[PDB]
Design a protein around this motif. Structure first.
Motif, PDB file in Angstrom:
ATOM      1  N   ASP A   7       1.070  -1.307   0.161  1.00  0.00           N
ATOM      2  CA  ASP A   7       0.127  -0.349  -0.219  1.00  0.00           C
ATOM      3  C   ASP A   7       0.720   1.351  -0.185  1.00  0.00           C
ATOM      4  N   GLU A  56      -0.960  -0.909  -6.308  1.00  0.00           N
ATOM      5  CA  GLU A  56      -1.770   0.113  -6.655  1.00  0.00           C
ATOM      6  C   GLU A  56      -1.966   1.399  -7.017  1.00  0.00           C
ATOM      7  N   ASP A 101      -5.206  -2.288   3.740  1.00  0.00           N
ATOM      8  CA  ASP A 101      -4.611  -2.942   2.558  1.00  0.00           C
ATOM      9  C   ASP A 101      -3.825  -3.375   1.812  1.00  0.00           C
TER      10      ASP A 101
HETATM   11 MG   LIG Z   1      -3.985   2.401  -1.032  1.00  0.00          MG
END
Ligand SMILES: [Mg+2]
Ligand SMILES: [Mg+2]
Lengths: 305, 317, 306, 318
Positions: A7, A56, A101
């Motif tokens: 993350d 991400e 996350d």
């Molecule tokens: Mg994130």
RNA sequence: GUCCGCAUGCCGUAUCGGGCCUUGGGUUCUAACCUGUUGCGUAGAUUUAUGCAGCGGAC
RNA sequence: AGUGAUAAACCGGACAGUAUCAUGGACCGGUUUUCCCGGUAAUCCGUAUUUGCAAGGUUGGUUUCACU
DNA sequence: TACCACCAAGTTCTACAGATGAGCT
DNA sequence: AGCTCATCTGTAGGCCTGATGGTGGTA
DNA sequence: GGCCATAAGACTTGTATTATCCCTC
DNA sequence: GAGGGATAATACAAGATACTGTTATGGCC
């Protein structure tokens, strides 16, 4: 084969290693060159040599670490964050935090096994960055044009001075874009092919090439049309707004001032399709034909349409 | 006395007269200097000497006709477009939403007898134009600032060139604003009084002058705070209905926009502001709630100080 | 010499605001009680107010006693739909909502708009409407229990069954009470018969229509009565009595399905490519207009006209 | 060896999709009947599918018979929260043809996630939940008629008064049927007594809590039971810049969440341990309803805690 | 040509819902602490776009 | 049902924006409610840009033609 | 004369109120 | 045994699904 | 070979503003 | 005394009206 979720924040990274046995390892690092070196060391400390890493798209803050790990010889995947959000709901998670996350992404990686990411070529990066800048300036130029419509006389010198500056700067970028594509033999050739399509000119060829790239990273033309957010579901709009918006005026020119365009417009007009609905269809068609023509390696041939 | 509604567009005007006897006279005109002369003649033709015209505040396109009629001697009211929409919904339960006709505006005029509109002083118009321009360039400058963070290297020369241009331009407008207010002895004096308030400096004083103007057109300071949209909106009924209060935001956005940073300076770096902050904080108010209260307070003191005609006296707070 | 008076209404209190001819205000609060209402009439006569136009929001049933008190005292009363009041406040540019503000707002509403006077309904109409809306309430509860029998567990079944029996007996009892009401009045009996002559309208729908149409010619046009039910388009407006609108859907289905004149209507719209429910919407409006039409005509339904 | 099967259920028909180890599928539709269920099992055994993990959406009473059939046939059954299904579909692509979830999607859901196994409830656990749910329905109807009393016309009042009496008697009758159910089973008799030892939990809240907790302890930690009720705060945090407000998640059964509101109001007002908790939270700038929210969670958690401990509420622990 | 008449054409997706499912995060570590605004009930009010078409009557 | 082929056919309403408008609830002295007259740079009721601006990510559904 | 099934299928507003359990009379 | 009284802006997600009233048709 | 008119009608993370005080040269 | 840096605030929703430009091509001088 380990599975690793990261993350990303501006300043820090949160990492979550999912071991084959099913236990986790977790650590925070600074989102810096020094931090990225600590990360690779820490992984090779725990004898993690073969791993698939999932991260991400988070602004540009994920890019340096993704390149770092790719060079270190790990499989890196950079996922559309919409997928991660849906995945979190599918796992019935009841909180959103950095460590939650990072763990979510490790599971994403194991279950989904997403496609591997490749770092773009330096030239691909540069061209994309010039096209994006050019669009930002164009938008500012339009803002200032709208202002002249209702401007007071004291405001008018300021607005005019700005319009001149913006017009000169746009012209400078255009030349900087041209110099870039002319200097690379591949880009020079691929751009000349895109322009042979009726309805595609200097501006749109550079945008198309910015998002297609140097290599044929799409297997089928229809995948590129999906990429742009142009395929129906209403249009999905699951794709770059900047690519999609750039095809609208080329679509109008095609359907209005070209043989192959008018032919397409009429055929859909016959079947009772409204003005914009046709333009929508022509946008999707231009995307698809652009990719097709590049695969062929040959000028646009109208006989095919 | 007649009652006239005008529905305005870029190119065309639509007029509806409402006679004392209750009959209507309607005609369309071009939204041009020629069109406006035709209008006055057509009114003067039908022996309409006294009238009360009501026009929506749609933008810059309706200003020339409003000034034309005000000069012709009629009473002109320029009304907030949201009032017109609400008026229609008060006239029936199944009225065409998203439509306010010239006929509807003539009724509005008759029933409500709205306050008269006065064309601003050329100097007030100038100052407001420069201040609004200044705000637009600030926003573009913040756009480009934000971009430098995540910019690619090929992009940076472009963003740097633009930032230097926008800074030079901002500095130039600031000077132009200063030369405007210094060349008028009333504005020069009024601006000096505003800047005596702790937390109000060069940029906020100009914005305030732009919306207060030369004359004192508000009878009371609490009305100027309402004008900016800074007063709390109470919501109570009977025993059951008890909505929470909130900043109304029903008022001029440019005024309200300009007061947040001053409010943050006043409650932080200043005696009378910290005094105010500490009291409300004790009474359980959050940080940004206190800021909204200081925003209303600055507005109200700005109007108070100008009306007093003397510098900011701390003893009053 | 006409005064304009606003009254904001709560369960327990009334806020009253009197706007005088000269333009000055007089205000006072009162208890929302018989004694409070007497104090209100005294306070007005104290201030030498004989001719006034009073404006009050429809606020549940809490506004009704004082409305009747003032109407009897001889004042003009308007009971306004409160959606209009909310629009009016916004048109008036008001930035707060309180009881004293609302009473002042209603006094201006009165002066500016001059709304039509309100007449208290006939006792028979009041009773019939009360019985009809009760019947609808119990039908709603019966459908809920009946839907539950589908998915019910076996331990739940005795309870649901016992309730269904209770609700069926009660619904029958109410229907009989409605029939006894409309029979004991010669006019209602006659009008009930005329409405039921329309194919698609039976015992239940006729009582609902009587409960809203009135005893007398209350509406001046058929489309007015259709708007009153919320059936005219603006998509269908749905700005009107839900109890009247609710009542017309199943009549609309049976008419378009199993009657000559209804099938005729259905086919005409189906020719122009209208969906199932869109036709039903249209038939609901038509039934409302014909119900009003037949009563006005004073003679049984004649299919020839349609 | 292990097959993965999705079943898309409706009132009338089943739609089955087997996903084989090799990666090819089998599909067949069946009637949603006792015959159909027997036909389904035989069709699976026909294809020599002896080990499988079936995945079904929780859509109500229409899918319960088939789930029971397969569980008895010896297969592993998962009955998933349908919201998980919809979200999984959106995680599988950005531009899916439809948002609908079908049997093929459920087979893939099952393979990727290997969800937890479903167990058919105890007949008594099923009876008790049914009675408690019925009780809540009768209360809502009673509340409707109470509200109507206030503003009723006189011609309506006989009807409302008669209904109120009927409902009051029925609610009293049903409370006794619940009391008889729990008293007759020594395990339920004991567990229910434990719950009522907690200050702020009485006869109505104990039966609701038993209805959802059941006879056995199927949560590893008490906090998981509060999550089950939807009573846990939902944190929303990311990086330096993204910070939402924590609000009750509400991702759980409404019945429990509904049942605990007044017990919470009672606990914080009248009991010692509840006032203690109210005071500390109120010392910080916590509002009244915020504290109620907190006490609802705590009651849920102590309810599960005390049952797991197997001994009455000890105040020394608070 | 104007004014009236209309159970007329064009326009129209009713009402009430019901049932079932839900195994937090952090900590000084699970009946402790930090993080927490349940449920969604009741009543009343609602007078045309006659806007445009037809068809009929009167002047 | 898989696998390939696809610049063909069917399904397709892009984006970015601009300008402008806004005269509290009340409180404090008179009257002895409010209104009205006089006063309000004080007290109570306030989450700015009617929640502003920036960047990044996005590998169709089907129909035909083969092959099994 | 009484019983059956089948037609159609995925707005606003102005005010109000209950619930449960522990302590007190 | 019966009564009192404790909180006030608004904001979880999904998937299955049905009666109503009146009429012509049938018993 | 240069110039003009015309065609259609949501996810993952970040950020400044101004005015005053305080500091260094 | 002039010039520059650091700093204050954090869940979000909750009025309206009038409007415009983008590109590429086939036409024009
Ligand atoms: Mg994130
Ligand atoms: Mg009211």
């Amino acid at each position: 084969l380990h599975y690793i979720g990261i993350d990303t924040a501006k300043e820090k990274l949160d990492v979550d290693v999912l071991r084959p046995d099913g236990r986790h390892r977790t650590k925070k690092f600074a989102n810096t060159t020094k931090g990225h070196d600590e990360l690779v060391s820490w992984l090779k400390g725990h004898k993690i040599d073969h791993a698939h890493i999932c991260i991400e798209a988070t602004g540009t803050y994920m890019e340096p670490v993704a390149e770092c790990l790719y060079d270190a010889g790990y499989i890196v995947s950079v996922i559309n964050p919409a997928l991660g959000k849906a995945f979190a709901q599918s796992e019935g998670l009841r909180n959103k935090t950095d460590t939650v996350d990072a763990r979510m992404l490790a599971e994403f990686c194991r279950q989904k096994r997403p496609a591997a990411w490749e770092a773009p070529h330096p030239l691909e990066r540069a061209l994309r960055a010039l096209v994006v800048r050019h669009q930002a300036l164009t938008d500012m130029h339009t803002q200032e044009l709208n202002r002249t419509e209702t401007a007071r006389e004291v405001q008018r010198p300021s607005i005019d001075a700005h319009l001149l500056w913006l017009e000169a700067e746009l012209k400078r970028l255009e030349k900087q874009i041209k110099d870039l594509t002319d200097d690379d033999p591949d880009m020079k050739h691929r751009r000349k092919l895109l322009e042979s399509i009726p309805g595609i000119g200097e501006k749109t060829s550079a945008v198309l090439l910015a998002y297609i790239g140097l290599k044929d990273r799409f297997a089928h033309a229809r995948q590129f049309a999906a990429f742009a957010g142009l395929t129906p579901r209403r249009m999905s709009k699951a794709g770059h707004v900047s690519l999609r918006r750039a095809l609208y005026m080329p679509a109008m020119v095609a359907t209005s001032k070209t043989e192959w365009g008018r032919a397409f417009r009429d055929r859909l007009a016959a079947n009772g399709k409204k003005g914009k609905v046709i333009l929508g269809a022509m946008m999707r068609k231009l995307a698809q034909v652009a990719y097709g023509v590049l695969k062929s390696g040959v000028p646009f041939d109208a006989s095919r349409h």
